[PDB]
């Protein structure tokens, strides 16, 4: 549904677990390729994978 | 180096372990997105992940 609206910019506001889950789902669906930008809205960046 | 020559078609002739390793590396580098074609050159297709 996000691709249906051509959303190349996504802001994730979650903890270290939901961020990891969403990242794994992005990798599975193949959206971590060049052309997208993510912002991890939390004080811990290097905490996740 | 393969992308330097614009190689969208790849034929993997390996066992069930090297195929899994190459698939994991493809997923990490982000090349399983639409626009590529792979041929697993072995008698076992559903054996791997």
Automatic annotation (TrEMBL), chains A, B:
It is found in: Postsynaptic cell membrane; Postsynaptic density membrane. Belongs to the glutamate-gated ion channel (TC 1.A.10.1) family. Receptor for glutamate that functions as a ligand-gated ion channel in the central nervous system and plays an important role in excitatory synaptic transmission. L-glutamate acts as an excitatory neurotransmitter at many synapses in the central nervous system. This is Glutamate receptor. It comes from Mus musculus. The chain holds residues 198 to 246 of 883 of the full protein.
